[PDB]
Design an enzyme around this catalytic site. Sequence first.
Site, PDB file in Angstrom:
ATOM      1  N   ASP A 163     -27.399  -6.739  21.943  1.00 52.95           N
ATOM      2  CA  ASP A 163     -27.324  -6.348  20.410  1.00 52.95           C
ATOM      3  C   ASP A 163     -28.267  -7.290  19.740  1.00 52.95           C
ATOM      4  O   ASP A 163     -27.982  -8.570  19.296  1.00 52.95           O
ATOM      5  CB  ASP A 163     -26.015  -6.429  19.915  1.00 52.95           C
TER       6      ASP A 163
ATOM      7  N   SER B  15     -42.489  -1.092   8.983  1.00 52.26           N
ATOM      8  CA  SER B  15     -43.153   0.195   9.553  1.00 52.26           C
ATOM      9  C   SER B  15     -44.313   0.489   8.737  1.00 52.26           C
ATOM     10  O   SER B  15     -44.003   0.631   7.531  1.00 52.26           O
ATOM     11  CB  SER B  15     -42.269   1.146   9.972  1.00 52.26           C
TER      12      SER B  15
END
Length: 330
Positions: A35, A199
Site C-alpha cells: 500500500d 498530473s
Amino acid sequence: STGSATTTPIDSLDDAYITPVQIGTPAQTLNLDFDTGSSDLWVFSSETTASEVDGQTIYTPSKSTTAKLLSGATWSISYGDGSSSSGDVYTDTVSVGGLTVTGQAVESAKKVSSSFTEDSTIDGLLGLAFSTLNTVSPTQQKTFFDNAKASLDSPVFTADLGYHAPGTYNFGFIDTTAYTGSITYTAVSTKQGFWEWTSTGYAVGSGTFKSTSIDGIADTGTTLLYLPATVVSAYWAQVSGAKSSSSVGGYVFPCSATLPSFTFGVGSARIVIPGDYIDFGPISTGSSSCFGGIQSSAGIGINIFGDVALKAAFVVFNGATTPTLGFASK
C-alpha cells in the site's frame, strides 16, 4: 541488494493485490497488500481477537526466534474506506522477494474492522508511503522500504500491476525489460506523507487532451481512480446511460456499454487506461448495472491514482533524497 516479488489480484475484479512476505525465523509467509498510500506493516496474528479472524494466515511471534516485543508500542490506523485496525508491535526479520530487513516493525493486530475480517485473502498490509505517516506510538517506526533503502543498489521500488493478471514489485532496481518507450519522471511532494504529484491533464477516448493540473497520490492500496467531479463527469458523459447513483455510491453504467479509454498526463507524456480497465462489473450478482472504475474524489479531499490508473503503467517510486515518481507505458 535487490528484491523481486510477484503480486497477484485477490479476485476477478483486481480489487486489490497480494504479495507474499516472509516474517520471522523460521519464515512465516503471509500475503500482504502493498500500500503506497499508508506506512504501517500490520498483520493478522495470534493476538487478533478470534471472532475477527476468518480464514487469514496469522503471524505468531512466539514461534519466531527473532521476534522481540517492542515494549510499550501500540498502533491504530483508519483508512480512506473507513476500515481500521489496531494492536501492539514486534520487531522481526522481514523478507520480500529475497530482500531482507532485520529489526522491521511488525504491527500485530489485536483488533480489525469487519472489512478486513471478511476478506480472507489479505493477511495484512505493508505500507510504502513515507514513514512520517506511520502510526506507531510513542516511537514512530520506519517502513520496510525506508529500512531497506541504504542497502538497496538504488533507493527505488517499482510497481508493475497486472490487469486481471499477476504483476511485480521490485526493490532496488529498474527492470528495463518491463516497459516500453521511456520513463517520464515527475516531482513529488512529501508534505502530506504520500507519493503526491501533479498530473498535467487528461483525455477521454479519442478526444482532445485537456491541459490542467491535477494534484493526486499514487496509491497501490486504492482500487479505483478518483478524480475531480468535472473530469469524472466529462468521462461518463461519453457512455450512453451512465449516471451517478446516490444509492449505489457512485457512477454506474449499463453493462451493455463499451467504455472509452482514459488518458492521463505525466509531464509531456501520456498514460492510456483502456476502457476495459474501467469496468468493475455488476453492482450485484446478475445486475445489468455495472460499477465504474473512475469515480469522483469530491469529499475524499484528495485525488487518488489507484490501481485502475497504476496498472496501466510501469511506475517508479524513487526514494532518493529528492523523491520523484516515474511512469512508463508497458
